[PDB]
Amino acid sequence: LEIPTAIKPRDGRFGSGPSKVRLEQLQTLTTTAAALFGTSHRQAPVKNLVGRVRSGLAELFSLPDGYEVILGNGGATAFWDAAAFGLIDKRSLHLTYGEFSAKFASAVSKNPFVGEPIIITSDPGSAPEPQTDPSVDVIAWAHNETSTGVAVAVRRPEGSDDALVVIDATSGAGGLPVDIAETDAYYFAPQKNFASDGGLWLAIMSPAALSRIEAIAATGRWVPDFLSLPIAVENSLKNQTYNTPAIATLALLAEQIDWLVGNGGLDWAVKRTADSSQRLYSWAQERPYTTPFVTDPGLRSQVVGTIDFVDDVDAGTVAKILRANGIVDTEPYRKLGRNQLRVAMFPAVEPDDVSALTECVDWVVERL
């Protein structure tokens, strides 16, 4: 099946990380950023680039006093292990409702430097309510569960005074609203809403989280240096990382932050993803062969939309035909095992392209 060009989106990338890298943003690598490549991360030109990223994120996320942008190599998966060693003192409570929220709880359960976590589960497509427990000093959940398309509210739970709020915003940060004052560690990686590459983690940390990192280091608890949050904080405060970061990753990230801030900031990004996701969900509701996987509209992610298909319409065949027509990465999370499409709607994704995608899906399904 050859989809007519007239109905095709301008950009066919609907992947949930890595995701659409804007043409003008990628072009900065051979132009405005060409002179930064291959230069020292211990010298002013690359340190100023890290500085642009940190102050840019501080502006975009309206950071309260004493909050800091901390960064290091590895991506969000490395941050899970760094946080298990460095942020959790004795015990944590985790909400699990998909791949990424479950994987952080599983990393904490296996880590022999911290206690057995309390795990509150819910079926995929749903989420438990943010909650606390008197025996925990960390409470963790994902702002956006990328495998299921579920977005959860980011609020400091009642009676959680003695616990840090540790939020995996890998696919949520930059596309969803957030009051950073409600968090202690709001972490992410650049390949989703920030339209950059993986291999770097970023974490917005509160004064309580920074003090906690210092207090845990002061106990003498061992941590491999690569996963050390005290070393990552020491370096981040001076526009550096512990080891050599990727200049391309920082250059693409800084360009996306500038673009988001220049468009009106987080409020603009949230309006944009609301617009894209409204097009996707309204279409999924209208068509008799589709339905949103997430039944609670309050949990339906603005940035990652999981659309279930009925028995007689094979979503896998639809995804294959779309891919053969250059409309890529609509395949559901590889481990979920559902007759579903997963569509990313991060701010780089044009809302009109989400509309064009739905028309392409209708066109293909009518010819199956």
Ligand X SMILES: Cc1ncc(COP(=O)(O)O)c(C=O)c1O
One symbol per residue from 92 to 121: x for binding a second copy (CB under 8 A), - otherwise; what is it? ---------------x--xxx---------
Q: What are the φ and ψ backbone dihedral angles of 322, each rounded to 5 degrees?
A: -55, -50
Examine residue 132 and tell whether it contacts ligand X (CB under 6 A).
Answer: no
Binding mask 21-60 for a second copy (x = CB under 8 A): x-x--xx-xx---x--xxxxxxx--x--------------
76 in contact with a second copy (CB under 8 A) = yes
Q: Kindly report the backbone phi and psi dihedral angles of residue 267, in degrees, each rounded to the nearest multiple of 5, phi listed first.
A: -60, -40
Q: Which is nearer to ligand X, 72 or 75 (CB)?
A: 75
Binding characters for ligand X, 48-77, by CB under 6 A (x = yes): ---------------------------xxx
Residue with Cβ nearer ligand X (70 or 321): 70
Region for 256 from its dihedrals, namely left if φ exceeds 0, alpha if ψ lies in -120 to 50, beta otherwise: alpha
Question: Distance (Å, rounded) from C-alpha 205 to C-alpha 185?
Answer: 5
Q: How many CA atoms lie within 13 A of 228 on its CB side?
A: 17
Binding residues for L-glutamate are 42
- Residues 159-218 binding a second copy (CB under 8 A) are 189, 191, 195, 197-200
Residue 342: which of a second copy, ligand X, none does it interact with, CB under 5 to 8 A by kind? none
Q: Rounded to the nearest whole angstrom, what is the least distance from the CB of residue 25 to a second copy in the complex?
A: 10
**How far, in Å, CA of 29 to CA of 252, rounded?**
8
Q: Which residues contact 167 (CB under 8 A, 6 or more apart)?
A: 140, 141, 142, 143, 154, 183, 185, 186, 187
Q: After which residues is the chain broken (C to N over 2.5 A)?
A: none
- Of 3, 8, 9, 19, the one binding a second copy (CB under 8 A) is 19
Of a second copy, ligand X, none, which one sits near residue 37, judging by CB under 5 to 8 A according to partner kind?
a second copy
- Identify which of 37, 85, 64 has the alpha carbon closest to the alpha carbon of residue 186: 64
Strands 138-142 and 304-309, by their bridges, are unpaired
**Tell me, what amino acid is at 289?**
Y
Nearest CB to a second copy, comparing residues 309 and 346: 346
Please name which of 120, 171, 121 lies closest in space to residue 145, comparing C-alpha atoms: 171
Among residue numbers 183 through 212, which ones bind ligand X (CB under 6 A)? Answer: 189, 198
Min dist. Cβ of residue 331 to ligand X (A): 13
Is the distance from CB of 169 to CB of 177 less than 8 angstroms? Answer: no
Order of strands across the sheet that contains 290-292 = 290-292, 304-309, 340-344
227 binds a second copy (CB under 8 A): yes
Supply the angle between the helices 247-262 and 266-286 in degrees, to the nearest 10. Answer: 90
The count of chain residues that interact with a second copy, using the rule CB under 8 A, is: 61
Binding mask 13-32 for ligand X (x = CB under 6 A): ----x---------------
Q: Which residues bind ligand X (CB under 6 A)?
A: 17, 75-77, 100, 142, 146, 168, 170-171, 189, 198, 243-244
Q: Which residues bind a second copy (CB under 8 A)?
A: 13, 15, 17-21, 23, 26-27, 29-30, 34, 37-43, 46, 73-78, 80-81, 84-85, 107, 110-112, 189, 191, 195, 197-200, 222, 224-227, 242-249, 252, 328-329, 331, 334, 348
